[PDB]
Symmetry: D2
Subunit: 215 residues, 4 copies
Amino acid sequence: IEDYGKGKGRIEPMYIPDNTFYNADDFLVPPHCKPYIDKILLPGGLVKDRVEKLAYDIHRTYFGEELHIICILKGSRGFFNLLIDYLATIQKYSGRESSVPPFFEHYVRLLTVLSDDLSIFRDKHVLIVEDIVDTGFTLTEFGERLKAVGPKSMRIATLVEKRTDRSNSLKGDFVGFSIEDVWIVGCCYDFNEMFRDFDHVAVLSDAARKKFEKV
Amino acid sequence: IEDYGKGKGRIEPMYIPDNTFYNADDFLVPPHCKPYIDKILLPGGLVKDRVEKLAYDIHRTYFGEELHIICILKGSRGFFNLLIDYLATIQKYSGRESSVPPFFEHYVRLLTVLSDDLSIFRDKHVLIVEDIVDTGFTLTEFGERLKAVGPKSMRIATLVEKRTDRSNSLKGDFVGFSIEDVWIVGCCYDFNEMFRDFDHVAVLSDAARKKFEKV
Amino acid sequence: ASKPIEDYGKGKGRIEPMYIPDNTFYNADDFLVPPHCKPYIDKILLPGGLVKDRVEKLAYDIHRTYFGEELHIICILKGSRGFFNLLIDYLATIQKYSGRESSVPPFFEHYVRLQNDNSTGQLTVLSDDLSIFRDKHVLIVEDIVDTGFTLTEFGERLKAVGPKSMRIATLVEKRTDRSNSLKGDFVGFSIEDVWIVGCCYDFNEMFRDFDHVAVLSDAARKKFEKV
Amino acid sequence: ASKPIEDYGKGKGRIEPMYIPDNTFYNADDFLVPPHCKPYIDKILLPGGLVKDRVEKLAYDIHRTYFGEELHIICILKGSRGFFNLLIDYLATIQKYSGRESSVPPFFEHYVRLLTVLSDDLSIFRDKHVLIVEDIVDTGFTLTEFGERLKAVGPKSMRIATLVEKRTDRSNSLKGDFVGFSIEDVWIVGCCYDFNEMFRDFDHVAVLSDAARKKFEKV
Ligand SMILES: [Mg+2]
Ligand SMILES: [Mg+2]
Ligand SMILES: [Mg+2]
Ligand SMILES: [Mg+2]
């Protein structure tokens, strides 16, 4: 447990090079975000393929063992959801017997994290999932409380990871992608509560930003 | 608006005749649910079929106006999740333009509802979502809390509604199926956080029952 | 001489399919039906999601029986399309998640082709050099077996090449008058003798793209027969 | 007869495909590769996902330009299966959710075998809107020869859809009307592209490696 937020021996996320993108012209963008998204960074399909592997990583990892996954509610809604879909199916086609469910959901809200009694995790596998840890002070503060109950393990799954130079530098043990620190909307990422329903993790327009700033 | 929980406009739910099931055995049931299930009320594929249908109906009812769907947390993941998927997709292939997102998502846990600072829905169109609605000591209570902010619309969308001998029991506006008063697990349907990940909705067993505690 | 391929279209040792009781039907108004079919579809036999859930299981069975060895599946063109498609998708996916070792792919696809009011039931299955099925496990996928003529005929034709085992998978079997008929090895539903359409079932090239297996209505028969 | 029928193979007034710069690949590693393909796939060109996403946009495109008018889609055997099938799936759906009624199915499928195309009577097509489907137009023969045949029956139009399009030197060829990607001249396999009937079932479009090549025929 001392290793947390460090990614001790993770498999490195897929590297997405600086200034690399796709034209939205090339996809079916829904009319409403239509005029706001100029560049796609992660296509919805790429995300799903990558996430499929992630699940597999995780499945082979806690196989034959109770896994307690936690959704930091709001933003983790897409990934976590993809994730649970894949584990479920994976274990179903597995053919390796296991008399336990692929995982156990749990929900929490936020900035500090807000949860019920954590006594439930004493001596258990704890997988906390997020869309991204842009700070991890909140992850560190919650991780603290998590420690006290003596859970069996505690890891972090994160969709994205920004190579920045401004933070508290916490890292997941299961990362989908490693990206240019740029602004991203879509795929549950949002501006001002906007773009969550777009399928592609897009780069935020100077235009999206205006309209979605004020008038 | 005075019609909440009343089911006034409502198109009638897919009606499932009494004592009608399918054997689990001719389905692919993940090893950790094998000893447990025997009869299947609803194949997840039948339920994705119905829900696609409700999505449409809903899409048809709020086209071009903002929609705020509140997900009563924990028990409504399945349904809620399957719903925005469609909602959004339908919006995309409609080619009939709208400057508005398919929906705005919101989460409320908690047998009272553990709120949020719901003033925001001051004239919005709100659809509350539930997996099933057996009673009303909450659905009716939160409905009143809402009512006070003069939201522009109030409707409930429920996956299931058991045919019952009760009264003043809420009715949905967008209802999935009408099933008899039976004990069902799976497809998010619970039993001590049990059978959630199972695809379909199963009638449970004394068996499934027995095993599930500390005895 | 090649070894003789034992039972074939017997149905020897198979697992019986989902049994669908007579007069069991869902109502079209309860699902989303597209406009081109709307006016003609009232009763639904098998809701397309139901048949996915069902073929998921068939594929599981198919996997367990040929896993680890080459499996060559033949798609009888036009009809067997949807069913076949659903099947290789599951097939390869299961293969992919099994985390259970194999140096051979899920399958190798193959395609072939082929009475009514005045003619003859001599739909003769046509294909290339069959010689490629020698010592191979072959699986013939049909959307339904209705005369067994064409499959008995092809059957003979394939037995001459000495394939290693030769089975048949069909989406539905109709409960109807007969004996002296081919029975599939892997089959999804047992249904009563009613005229179906949709989900790749057709009425004079119609309905294939409808997503559920429905019953043919008098209006469909009318609107779409020979004028 | 506006927006002709003599432009076939020209790809005139098309919408240029998605452009995939040279030397752009993903690591196989970052994907879940099936055991049987594991040692042969080192690099990925087009992740099966990116493919569905492109095809979704092709499906819409094809929809808009044929709405309410019968479309006949000819799939070219073995090779164009995956792509063909992603197409008609999206087509069916997009029409199901359109709210713009057509009184006609979203398509009529037909299949052809193979290099000459192996058709049956093409009479079925007189007056028809015909869309032809390929994983790729390798060279011009097959199509041109076939287009000649088709044109003999006078379709209402004949267009080509192709998934991939290669940047090549030999250009005196067919250009597609609806094409997925523009790629580098590299040897690919997966997502219905095979190497001697190998890797059709793989999910992604991979580059043909030497091991797999060295291993799948001439030893
Ligand atoms: Mg977060
Ligand atoms: Mg609930
Ligand atoms: Mg047939
Ligand atoms: Mg081809």
